[model samples]
Target: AGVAEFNDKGELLLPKNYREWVMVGTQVTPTEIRTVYVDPESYAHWKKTGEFRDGTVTVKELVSVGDRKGPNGYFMGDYIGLEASVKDSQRFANEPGNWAFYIFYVPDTPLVAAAKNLPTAECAACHKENAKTDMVFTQFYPVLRAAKATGESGVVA
Candidate 1:
């Protein structure tokens, strides 16, 4: 099994096989890019239920980099990206209050540092500005966004 490590630069050094997924433009969102849920239960629920509840969230923004690349030749990397609850409500209303996490794989190489440093703050800061919207970029996921807009409800899994 692979492990997650951080370099001297405080970049989340990932193992090989990880790839980028979404790279938001710096102009779109500024500072504190990435947001993560340090809680293990929140991570598990999102994977198992595809929906998370409130009061079980931890948020962390990327401090250094902003460029993310998913595993080459694959739709998702070996790892998944997850989010924590920003407030005491659902992130997208009809959606679960659970922090959203997605897959992010890395390759076994020196580039791991560069890939790790991909600042998460760039994304986190932008979302924080939209706290009422659950401090998330649900706009990127149409189906999920529609549910939020229409008040539809269900477990993604």
Candidate 2:
């Protein structure tokens, strides 16, 4: 039932308790496991439609896995940063996919925001070129993988 709402400043009043959202997937890069989360409804929609629904907000949390290496190899540490994509038609009319990116400098406080229209061209450009569905790189998401296997490719009301 939780949905992301933004202010006129394009700042999230206080991002949600993302820890409770359904985990879409995780990926380990050179130094971290990027954990992705999506609201349950949006997740269902993605499973059915192979696309993220408008109003959907996805968060990819950066966990430091390279430090304090254990036998398990890199293990999780404090959250280093976050990257988010919000899908809203009116909020991002000037963007390519109606999706806006919010790359936090650090998880200093609960608040988050993006620029007007999120004019950061490089990030969107990369996603636009390589993503598989709805400008999201389904190739990197295991939950998305399952959706591709068994979803209706449907829509959310």
Candidate 3:
């Protein structure tokens, strides 16, 4: 699944089967809940080397908070958005770690079938400065942490 299969024009195609991939972890922010996934191939690569391999596709699905609230907290509501981080040296040579980011979800709209990479300033800049492992926020992904080669926390200092 090299670069998760782009179109003839080189735009990244949306992985409609992403939910079937390995769920790595989840994070909650004030406005949304984010669940992350990695393709099986990439997960295996990361497990072996603790690094994201070329062709790796990582998806982050965002969900909104629902009106139903339990004693503990409010539950995840609607499936609102989907974003992706891809590693492909051939296509993203200029980006840090040969990684590119894309946004397929538009606010109050349906998910697009494909999307072009975002500008570096819109996404890559933050990843370059804050990510822990190969421009990935492995620090927050316990599943990845457990599978990675290194035993240390995936945190940059």
Candidate 4:
């Protein structure tokens, strides 16, 4: 019952209760914003080392964003997309860093089910160069950074 489903077409299916996962961090670009989440086991491993273990599942909820000034500063709008990175050495051996990437944009004519496993060149190449460890950008995640630096997981706030 915990995020282990795939359609006959090989489309990965996300867990219904994804909110239960702990948020790893958030990132904002000019056109999109994303909040990354991972299960507690993955989070704990990430805290120890930036590397993702086998079977690690990371989902990044994405949205179209604009600089809308508000009383509480800037905030995100409606969800527009979803991206995920799954680690499975055997499944993605040929892919760069043995990782797989997926994209599920909103407003789909035929709803996507955790789909979009693009070629390695499309996504993994960028992560290889940018990510601090094991194809994940730990630099952007303060909690991970703190953990990497001081071996402390509870200090990131």
Best by lDDT: 3
Which tens-of-lDDT digit does each residue in 53-138 have in candidate 3? 88999999999886664545677788889999899888888888898899999466667788888888999999989988888888
The superposed Cα distance between candidate 3 and the true structure at residue 51, in angstroms, equals: 1.1
TM-score of 2: 0.79
- Model 4's TM-score against the true structure: 0.79
Candidate 4 overall Cα lDDT vs. reference? 0.72
lDDT of 1 by residue, 26-129 (tens): 21223233433223443344345444345343433233334556642212222222222222343323323323322233122222233322223544454556
All candidates' lDDT scores?
A: 0.35, 0.72, 0.84, 0.72
Ranking by lDDT: 3, 4, 2, 1
lDDT of 3: 0.84
Model 3: pairs clashing at backbone N, Cα or C within 3 Å = none
Candidate number with greatest TM-score: 3
Sort the predicted structures by TM-score, highest score first: 3, 4, 2, 1
Q: TM-score for every candidate vs. truth? A: 0.28, 0.79, 0.87, 0.79
**For candidate 4, which ten residues in a row score worst on lDDT?**
1-10
What clash pairs does model 4 have?
Answer: none
Backbone-clash count (model 3): 0
lDDT of candidate 2 over 27-93, digit per residue (tens): 8875667888887788877677777788888888888765554544566787888777878887677
| Evaluation by TM-score, superior candidate among 1 and 4 | 4
Clashes of 1: 39
Name the lDDT value of residue 96 in candidate 1.
35
What's model 2's lDDT at 50? 71
Q: Which 10 residues in a row give candidate 3 its minimum summed lDDT?
A: 148-157
